[PDB]
């Protein structure tokens, strides 16, 4: 799965059988690392209007 955004730290732990995270507009906003096993939040760097 390829995506763009800013990887920040999180405090919402997942489950040991869960890997994936999704929200109200089916974007990946929380992810599991395969080696560190740490929860990471995806925030896009695309915020603004000119």
């Amino acid at each position: 799965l390829t995506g763009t955004g800013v990887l920040t730290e999180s405090n919402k732990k997942f489950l040991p059988f869960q890997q994936f995270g999704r929200d109200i507009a089916d974007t990946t906003d929380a992810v599991r690392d395969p080696q560190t096993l740490e929860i990471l939040d995806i925030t896009p760097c695309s915020f603004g209007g000119v």
């Binding site: 799965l1 390829t2 763009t4 109200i24 507009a25 089916d26 974007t27 695309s46 915020f47 209007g49």
Partner: protein, 423 residues
């Protein structure tokens, strides 16, 4: 059940029967009108494509569509800015309340703004803003931004307090020229005089009218704090349209996935162009449906804002003789209040309360000469024949400057023989 249509009563009509009111009520009624709504703007690139390059390449043959939709949302946003500026600017001059609060018994304390509050609103505006309850960054990451309104709530409350200070100190002269000061019992007596009630009716029971007005403002205060569905359904429809746009991204539309990066992770663009173009067609159809719904809603709120500006200019800046336009009853004055994305009026209406049954005659006969009343009605209490006005029973004797002569008496089918005093 089969629904009922109210009370079922017959008016006891005769050819010589008149119901003159004796006592009365002063009832303030409320009316809720939307003025504008939330100014949202949708850009096509983040909504349809996001951060994709071949999507922006393939959208250039639909580019004048997106120019049209950006044109439509910017026109909607400047239309609601024009709507709020048209409703809450009837004066070019900001008027203030004098620090002396002697208004002839009238208590103007809970519609004028309170300086002790951190905000500059009245308590009815405070508990009216608190009733309407207005996910943000999750929508804004998709491309769904909300523009802030031009006039802030402090500015709308300042315009409202300027119109209120003009209505209390001047009344209707500030809506038709420079503000001429006039004391409020003579202003409210002039609002009686615009109906047909004489001024001495107010000047004999001024404390009763002041207590009825203060108790009626208190009843509006207790009624509103215990609804505002004219303003709530507009925010509900707009938020439901934005959530409909949010759940119009997970639709596959006949493609294998609803995520463009998920499509690019498993397909080459020779076998991916038809599915990504199908997703362009589906998302552009969703956005076209949203723009059509928002334009119909903008036309409805524009018609309601034209009605609100008309009601402000005709009920606030003057006394309207249009029946059931500024309340339910004979209209005296109205007080605007600020509202979240709307306007709330407080239409103070003269409503008669009591009534008595009176024997009448359209003319009397004194000396073979029919005397018709100038501005009243002939009534009787059984033995004596009196002239009174059309909204209060004031026993006035028949005197020759209260009536006018017209011809002889044997031309009117209903006429009595009663002596004018002729002083």
């Amino acid at each position: 059940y089969t629904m009922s249509l109210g009370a079922e009563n017959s008016v006891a009509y005769s050819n010589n029967s008149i119901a003159i009111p004796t006592n009365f009520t002063i009832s303030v009624t409320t009316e809720i009108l939307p003025v504008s709504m939330t100014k949202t703007s949708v850009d096509c690139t983040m909504y349809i494509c996001g951060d994709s390059t071949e999507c922006s390449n393939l959208l250039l043959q639909y580019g004048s569509f997106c120019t049209q939709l950006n044109r439509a949302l910017t026109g909607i946003a400047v239309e609601q800015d024009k709507n709020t500026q048209e409703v809450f600017a009837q004066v070019k001059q900001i008027y203030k309340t004098p620090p002396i609060k002697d208004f002839g018994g009238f208590n103007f304390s809970q519609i004028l703004p309170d300086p002790s509050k951190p905000s500059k609103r009245s308590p009815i505006e405070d508990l009216l803003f608190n009733k309407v309850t207005l996910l943000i960054c999750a929508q804004k990451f998709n491309g769904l931004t909300v523009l802030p309104p031009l006039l802030t709530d402090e500015m709308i409350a300042q315009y409202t307090s300027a119109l209120l200070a003009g209505t209390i100190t001047s009344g209707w002269t500030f809506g038709a020229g420079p503000a001429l000061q006039i004391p409020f019992p003579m202003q409210m007596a002039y609002r009686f005089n615009g109906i047909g009630v004489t001024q001495n009716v107010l000047y004999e029971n001024q404390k009763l009218i002041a207590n009825q007005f203060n108790s009626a403002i208190g009843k509006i205060q207790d009624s509103l704090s215990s609804a505002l569905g004219k303003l709530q359904d507009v925010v509900n429809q707009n938020a439901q349209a934005l959530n409909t746009l949010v759940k119009q991204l997970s639709s596959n539309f006949g493609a294998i996935s609803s995520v463009l990066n998920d499509i690019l992770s498993r397909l080459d663009p020779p076998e991916a162009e038809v599915q990504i173009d199908r997703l362009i067609t589906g998302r552009l159809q969703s956005l076209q449906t949203y723009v059509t719904q928002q334009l119909i809603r903008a036309a409805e709120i524009r018609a309601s804002a034209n009605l609100a500006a008309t009601k402000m200019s005709e009920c606030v800046l003057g006394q309207s003789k249009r029946v059931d336009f500024c309340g339910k009853g004979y209209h005296l004055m109205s007080f605007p209040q600020s509202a979240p994305h709307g306007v709330v009026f407080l239409h103070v209406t003269y409503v008669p309360a009591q009534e008595k049954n009176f024997t009448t005659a359209p003319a009397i006969c004194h000396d073979g000469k029919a005397h018709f009343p100038r501005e009243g009605v002939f009534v009787s209490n059984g033995t004596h024949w009196f002239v009174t006005q059309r909204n209060f029973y004031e026993p006035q004797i028949i005197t020759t400057d209260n009536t006018f002569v017209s011809g002889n008496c044997d031309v009117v089918i209903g006429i009595v023989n009663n002596t004018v005093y002729d002083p």
